[PDB]
Amino acid sequence: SYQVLARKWRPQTFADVVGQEHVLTALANGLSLGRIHHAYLFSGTRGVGKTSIARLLAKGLNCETGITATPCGVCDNCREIEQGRFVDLIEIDAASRTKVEDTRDLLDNVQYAPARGRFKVYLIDEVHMLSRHSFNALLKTLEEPPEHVKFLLATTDPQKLPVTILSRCLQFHLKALDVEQIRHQLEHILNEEHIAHEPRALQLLARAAEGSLRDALSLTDQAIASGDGQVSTQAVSAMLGTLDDDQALSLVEAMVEANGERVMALINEAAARGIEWEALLVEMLGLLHRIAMVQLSPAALGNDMAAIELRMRELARTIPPTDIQLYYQTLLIGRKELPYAPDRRMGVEMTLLRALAFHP
Amino acid sequence: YQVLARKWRPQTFADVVGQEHVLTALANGLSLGRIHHAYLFSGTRGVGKTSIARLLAKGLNCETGITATPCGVCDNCREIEQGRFVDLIEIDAASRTKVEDTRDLLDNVQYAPARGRFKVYLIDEVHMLSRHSFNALLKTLEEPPEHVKFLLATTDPQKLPVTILSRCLQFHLKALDVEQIRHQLEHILNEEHIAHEPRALQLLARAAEGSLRDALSLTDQAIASGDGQVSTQAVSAMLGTLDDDQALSLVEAMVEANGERVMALINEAAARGIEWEALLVEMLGLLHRIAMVQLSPAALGNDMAAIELRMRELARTIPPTDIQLYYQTLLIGRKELPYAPDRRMGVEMTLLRALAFHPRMPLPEPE
Amino acid sequence: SYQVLARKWRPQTFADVVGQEHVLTALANGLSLGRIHHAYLFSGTRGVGKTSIARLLAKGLNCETGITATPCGVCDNCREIEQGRFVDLIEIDAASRTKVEDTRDLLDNVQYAPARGRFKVYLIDEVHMLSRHSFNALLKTLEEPPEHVKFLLATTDPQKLPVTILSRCLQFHLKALDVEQIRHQLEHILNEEHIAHEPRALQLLARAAEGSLRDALSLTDQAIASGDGQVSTQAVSAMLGTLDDDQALSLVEAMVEANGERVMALINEAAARGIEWEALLVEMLGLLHRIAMVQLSPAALGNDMAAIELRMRELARTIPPTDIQLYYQTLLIGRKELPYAPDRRMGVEMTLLRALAFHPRMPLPEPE
Amino acid sequence: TSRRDWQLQQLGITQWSLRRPGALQGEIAIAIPAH
Amino acid sequence: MIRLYPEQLRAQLNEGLRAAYLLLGNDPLLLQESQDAVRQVAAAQGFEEHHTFSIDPNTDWNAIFSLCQAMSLFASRQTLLLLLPENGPNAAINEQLLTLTGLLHDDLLLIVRGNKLSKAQENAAWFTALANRSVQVTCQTPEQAQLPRWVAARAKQLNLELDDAANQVLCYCYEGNLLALAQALERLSLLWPDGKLTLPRVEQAVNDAAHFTPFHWVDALLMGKSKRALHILQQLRLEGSEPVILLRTLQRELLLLVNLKRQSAHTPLRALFDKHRVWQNRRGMMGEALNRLSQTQLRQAVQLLTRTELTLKQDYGQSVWAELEGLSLLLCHKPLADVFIDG
Amino acid sequence: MRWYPWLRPDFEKLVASYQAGRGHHALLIQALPGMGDDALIYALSRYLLCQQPQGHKSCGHCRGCQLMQAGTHPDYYTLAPEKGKNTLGVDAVREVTEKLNEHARLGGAKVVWVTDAALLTDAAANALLKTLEEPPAETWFFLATREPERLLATLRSRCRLHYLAPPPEQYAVTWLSREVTMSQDALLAALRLSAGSPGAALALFQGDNWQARETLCQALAYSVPSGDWYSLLAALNHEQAPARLHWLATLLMDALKRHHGAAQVTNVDVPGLVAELANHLSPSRLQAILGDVCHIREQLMSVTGINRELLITDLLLRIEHYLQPGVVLPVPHL
């Protein structure tokens, strides 16, 4: 049966996971030395390997060949965990199991020995959704549980949990994956999938991933569906609404030089062409940052913008740094309020007019 | 293999680090025989409320008698240590929050203890009990049976009714000092025959605000990361906090208005692979420390002593107004970091804000 | 165990009741003249003698001698009441007895005659918590009780109770014992137990009790524990410092007087207490708001708080409106920017420094 | 007022002033406070 | 069909009992004493039965019908009391009441207690039928202006001596709680048999146990007496009343005042009052509120109210009472720079 | 629901993925109101549930098609908020997930339609996350939301996002002209007002919203010269207050753009009102008032049960305060 790239390429060993070297090393060393805790909380942004790392740790603990740092993935228990069948690996959703009876039976069945494995792993997802009474009741279990149960906790944000929970759990901060790691993983996946890919497309997808690899895979699947089974630069640009042209620079120049009619015409034609407005704001922010950098250090400018070098240089010679900071601040304010505006076009126009109000 | 927090739980009054006032009060009460029937323990997480409560329970029910120095070898002491003592009723407030459940709990209070000399009750997070439960508990708290002792515990004592507070002896445990946490970590690591470095212990103690349990958890995580040893590099990498020297050089470059050094330092940080928000937080902390030093002379702890003198220079040369300006600029940049196109880009633009609006040496203003 | 002072020193006779002179005189007159109301409502605060006075009334109303205002204290009924095991003394709590079934059972049992007491006194506690059904049942049974039953209600917040209960009940709202009475009672208790003490320690304990004798007894028991069988000024002062939770007011005072080292010491003490920093900022902001309102109108300081009344009044009269305005604005800005501060502790320290030794440049409405 | 102050206000910078000196005591030897 | 008052009801009972009685009002002490006086007069006349029932859909009526159609085995000429529901009679209750009036018997003495009926509820078949032999005793709680005279009369009836200061203290401590006021008078009489109650005498043996309503608080703010507004806010806070109803009640009058002030620039006040159909007794009060504050106020007040609502139902804090008392002081003739209140 | 012509291409694309068996289990349609995303989701579900589909369209006579017409298919478990409410609870998601947890009765494919993921509760979305991550075989989800940013980051991450762009402006204008007999200027004004999404403009024309907009415009025209903005409340206090606030914001934006110089304005149907508003107010005042109006509209939309008239009159009083000379005008800042 066909599966999406996120499900197809879920890591099955501690070597298939990309990034998060520190937490993986800590887990492997703990498993090797036998110093294993009873509460592993994983904190980080979405699409960084919370569930993947938790399942890998569960496989390592429950492997039939003893506690192994890198589970083989072929045992009966290993395969069942990989398929989400292992009874001793209870995957609980915090939001669903918020009622009193749910937690009461959760802490009442701990005494029963594991059915198959040597540890009755409890993988609780988005633990921050549990009620305060749930945390209070589970403190005792999280402190001194029996030596047959391990609690694996996953939450997008750890600060919302009670301080006691953080005290009783080993916290692993999954770092957001950088652009290079996402690009390398996408390149490897596409090569193993026998799908042609261009470096520009991979770079754009990694940039749009915003640090989450699941989002990168979802964008790749979207491009595949729209790109007639081909990861082409033009298809990815059309899907993502990336200008990658001089329109952003011209609009920034118009904004700095007031001339509201030019800015309005540029926005009108951009809307007619149907682009992504968040992409336009990000491009403007990048251009303003580059202008500030060249004002500080002229050598900090690349050659990709060579065709627009001199004009850009003119801004670095014409706009004082304080005005650049003001424009960047206004663009960021527009970025923050763009989702909440009545319309995306209205938000962009308000941001640009506010920036236009500023002048020497 | 056992967790440090569980293995190194106190087993006698001497083992408790800090909290001298409550320990002395309890020891004197046990020795003189003037024992109250209701003790409330308060403080922050991991300070040792439950440890002290269990030590008191051991002292009361010890076979040799009621003493402030329980033997630790008789059957009652061993059972309480293992958490399998019948008379020591460890109750959770959240487990029984309704009035009916607490009434059921109190129905069995009258019965004599099984083997222990007292039927000690230890309620955890007592503030979670409902108002009706508190009112029902008031009568037994005022006049409990002579063989019954209550040991309430809660992180937030202000939620309790005034009647409950007045009916029991209060003991507010204080957050342990950083030096005490470091000493405890050093002692346990030495007892476990584990190599450690002073800087790593200082970093762990700083990470654990006042909760020794957090200190032990972080120490265990550092043990895992370092493969059985606590090295300064391993702890620094795990905490994600770069060395204070790099942030100090960054702020020195920022105040000097030389952006080349700032660019070089941020490039080196990027090569090191350190999250940018941590760098910004460290810069803000350095600015705050400088401001505090300006306010008062003894504002820097011994942990920063290695870089104290240099810091003091920044206090003398840099006025206070521009210190506040830099602090505000960095804080607003951190406010804007999530919405920036990139974390590196956000930090670079914040530093460029700081340099452009530099009071002493503003960045050049070309028309 | 040597018992505890609160349990040992329950007033077993009307003569040894501290304060509440008006209630004591009214009860004595009622008992002597033989006129007893259907229901009594003792209200006030905690640790003032509501339960003690109710039990005194119960034992004096069912004494073997008769209905007397000076119970013997040695007969079977008085001794049983003192031991708290008298069958007719039916002590119940509205906490766990608000159920319809329990209220119905109580109403049914009311009709039965007392076992061995002249009156079957029902000492209900926290009556303000009774549900509407239970409250109506109580009103109906109090409309015309049998001559052999009595009700001694003991609440703590009569405002919750509708006046309907008062329509058939006589109220004797107690008052705070005041510092002098509490200090004298503590001195008498300590002397009677051959306990060494200093007058300043007794004064501190009485002032800290905040108009509650039970609180004073608990505090002096703590002092004995920490003092090693002897109350001393240093011991009680240290205990108060450990237990004090008024860091917000002290910080506001230090900010008012621009005492930087005092602010640092208070912040360190709060950190040792480990209070939530945003909560501390909110408390300080509320204190500043209360100071401003007190300056606007003296009546703004409600009687609900009295331990810090003098401090609040002196702060309100001393500082001008502009300084308190600046403090409030700085604290508000600090609270708003606290989430993005490098640390909660650092944010609190920074906002305190800004308030005590800085001032924000206000915006200018540039002409249009 | 000035361009500097207006720009800092628009950026959200408070520009805290000293107003009450003397409170800053200890090892402070700021010879030139730029004021 | 005689409308009377509890003060003069004793003479009406003495001259002769009436077939139908009904006590309408909100004052608890006045209703209770009128009921007790009527019951005692009935007992003296020779009525031994004092049946009491509460009107409610859950409650049945077969027992009531049987007792009204039957005498007492060891007594005669029963008396029946009906406790009307707080909201008031509904259609089913109206049918029940007219049925009771249909088979009402002279030997039965009817008493009715409950909240005063409204104009719409005033007219009814049973009410008109009973009007031929109905004496209704108004039992409303006297206003603050009427309180001092009432307490003075009460004290004089008790052979006590009260001065102006003692009367003011009693009014302040037991405003709207006349039951507690009478109980305090009895307690003071017992404490000091001499009968002379000076200011120390009353002040040393009284407690603040007044009860209020949000309308009273809004009225206090309109008048502008800061002490009364703070006292009523304290009483409502201690009573546990939620601030939502207070905020809504304040908001209604605030919007009315804003509209009147803005539209009064070129429009007579009388026309606006007539169009708005506001209470006649409140015309002068609204005029005083309008001329007491100018358009500079009524602007920070609305913004303060909006901020209060936001901080209430978004932050879910406990400082709502502080904001309420700040707004109370603002509505009075006070400076209230509003920097503290963040208006 | 209606099937608009501009849904032809995108549908023909999406179904093609399902024609190859590579369709994404979780699909999130980012479409503005009036774009007919519901019709697209219904067509996709019909194609998926057809037993013997031919080409792209369903046969229309197999058992699946008959059940779809009857609207009683054992599969096709739709999620929507209660009629008397505006949010979807966690219980509905729980029961729908439990139903999806087993095989389809017809043996084909199971479809789940979330009418509006924006209304989905945080707990409900978090519960749906698990079933969305690894749906059972032949299980398909069709979410919908106007602003995917408002959704949780995780939920957006799980889904494959498809953006339903609106038609060309001229195409929408001519379609509305063929549909509704009204001046082309009004049609263009409605289209620009509705973010250039036909259908939403058609819905606005069908209801009394157009008369409300005209009344609001007349009230604002009367208010701007005299400065009595309070009267605007009379034309603003209504259950559709957010829409009226959006109309006012668009008018202010048009006036500001006219001040800065522009060739096109959203409210083209009222040149006189825009000109007067631009002339009688300075750009700073226009910006401040527009920001305040947008903030209050956001507060009204997000906050539940807020006192509408209180917020509206507070906004009016603050606007009147801003017009007073010498008053500092607030500026937006995160």
Ligand SMILES: Nc1ncnc2c1ncn2[C@@H]1O[C@H](COP(=O)(O)OP(=O)(O)OP(O)(O)=S)[C@@H](O)[C@H]1O
């Ligand atoms: N660190 C990673 N290494 C390798 N693949 C990853 C990683 N993070 C995410 N993925 C891919 O994304 C898929 C789903 O992401 P997860 O592993 O569940 O991360 P996640 O943090 O658990 O997502 P959330 O928090 O539940 S939204 C996996 O099956 C992988 O294909």
Ligand SMILES: Nc1ncnc2c1ncn2[C@@H]1O[C@H](COP(=O)(O)OP(=O)(O)OP(O)(O)=S)[C@@H](O)[C@H]1O
């Ligand atoms: N005061 C202390 N003295 C010695 N060890 C301590 C102390 N506080 C904490 N520890 C160590 O940390 C562990 C946790 O202590 P606990 O007393 O269980 O924490 P806790 O305060 O009971 O948790 P809370 O307050 O309910 S969140 C102990 O087993 C010790 O190893």
Ligand SMILES: Nc1ncnc2c1ncn2[C@@H]1O[C@H](COP(=O)(O)OP(=O)(O)OP(O)(O)=S)[C@@H](O)[C@H]1O
């Ligand atoms: N008026 C008093 N005179 C002497 N001792 C008192 C007095 N009030 C309290 N005490 C002491 O405090 C103990 C407890 O007082 P209580 O009478 O229970 O207080 P309380 O009014 O019952 O508080 P509540 O009703 O439970 S909130 C008594 O046993 C005495 O030792």
Ligand SMILES: [Mg+2]
């Ligand atoms: Mg996951």
Ligand SMILES: [Mg+2]
């Ligand atoms: Mg504990």
Ligand SMILES: [Mg+2]
């Ligand atoms: Mg009591």
Ligand SMILES: [Zn+2]
């Ligand atoms: Zn295996």
Ligand SMILES: [Zn+2]
């Ligand atoms: Zn022992």
Ligand SMILES: [Zn+2]
């Ligand atoms: Zn006796």
Ligand SMILES: [Zn+2]
């Ligand atoms: Zn078909």
